[PDB]
């Protein structure tokens with residue numbers, strides 16, 4: 196169902 | 211003192227802008243940076259803005275604000291649990307798949323709201339803010355925290371004041387991670403954060419496009435550590451309103467849910483412009499409401515979410531492998547890999563749950579171990595493409611000999627990796643049993659133990675597979691054929 200799943204605390208690049 | 215802090219931040223910027231020192235000097239560098247940061251921090255007054263009430267005194271305001279703006283506020287209550295901290299607790303029975311939480315877009319803090327706030331002028335000029343939405347959210351949080359009548363005050367006043375990200379660890383708590391895969395990322399996090407603090411401290415105290423910021427009166431290292439830790443432990447990617455792109459966001463009320471194993475049940479509803487969460491499992495009244503954060507490893511949970519998750523069914527470690535340019539068969543192996551859509555060298559994963567290696571890594575190791583005649587069969591003729599197609603499939607080996615070779619290699623490589631740790635599995639277990647430790651120290655020790663337990667599981671699995679395929683080769687059993 197989820198076209199746009201939401202990941203709590205999704206990992207991002209900080210540099 | 212203003213001139214004194216500015217000079218300490220100048221030195222910190224220079225130190226944390228220096229190139230990588232080499233893996234063997236990264237611990238030394240980390241301690242040096244910690245020394246500078248702690249000297250600055252002890253000369254400052256902590257968080258610039260603190261609140262008079264307790265954390266739980268502000269949850270009624272969060273609920274009223276969320277309610278007035280269309281969010282779900284019935285069926286749960288906020289409870290301070292020992293293991294996870296504050297979280298949501300069901301006050302009625304909630305059935306699996308029931309839509310029980312929703313949060314309209316107007317409540318969110320987004321990159322878009324950061325731009326249109328008092329941060330806007332500096333955002334429009336600073337190349338780093340424009341490129342790094344996570345850093346933009348952190349300053350959005352700090353600017354609204356320092357603004358007496360912020361729309362988001364009910365959210366900011368219910369956020370934690372401290373986190374268990376490694377930025378908060380003591381030196382000796384991080385020292386437990388020496389010789390692991392994870393510690394490099396702890397070093398990077400610390401250096402990145404200190405560099406960013408020093409850079410923006412200078413920008414805010416001198417640049418005119420930051421003249422109107424609420425942070426000019428006070429912007430402490432503790433402020434910045436708090437802000438980036440708030441974002442890293444709870445930020446989310448959501449679609450833009452027109453659904454064409456994605457953006458980062460903080461999602462109030464729903465982000466109070468703690469993590470358990472399962473599947474993602476939270477999605478964005480573009481048509482109605484709100485985040486929606488359905489119940490991951492049945493929750494009876496009095497049970498904590500959990501969500502599944504995502505398929506992250508315990509390394510990622512410790513470093514970026516500030517917790518270690520026992521029985522994480524998605525835990526993994528890295529293993530770097532590549533075909534050597536000195537291989538007489540390099541050209542053929544690289545061509546087979548390219549046709550299979552696999553690079554000639556890559557960082558793969560070893561998994562705790564069965565199976566320990568992915569289809570991609572299995573395919574890589576099969577090619578890595580192929581003979582010249584096997585390689586030719588995957589390159590030439592009307593069955594070559596069919597042979598490529600099964601390379602990731604455990605049920606269809608290239609040959610029994612190929613399997614014995616590749617599991618022998620993996621057993622030996624995982625065993626070698628285990629020998630590069632400064633403690634053993636048995637020693638780590640003794641530490642956890644026979645020492646009394648802080649939450650943070652236990653996070654570090656369990657993380658290094660977990661890395662080794664995954665390697666040890668891979669050794670045992672590879673040994674079972676090796677013996678299975680050795681017997682097939684001894685019996686010269688007919689190979690399976692894909693039909």
Ligand SMILES: Nc1ncnc2c1ncn2[C@@H]1O[C@H](CSCC[C@H](N)C(=O)O)[C@@H](O)[C@H]1O
Pocket residue numbers: 293294295296297369370374443444465466467468469470515516517518519
């Ligand atoms: N299963 C779990 N075990 C321990 N801590 C957890 C957890 N799931 C979530 N957390 C904690 O919750 C944070 C994510 S935000 C979730 C709400 C948070 N407990 C709060 O008091 O505001 C993480 O950074 C971690 O501190």
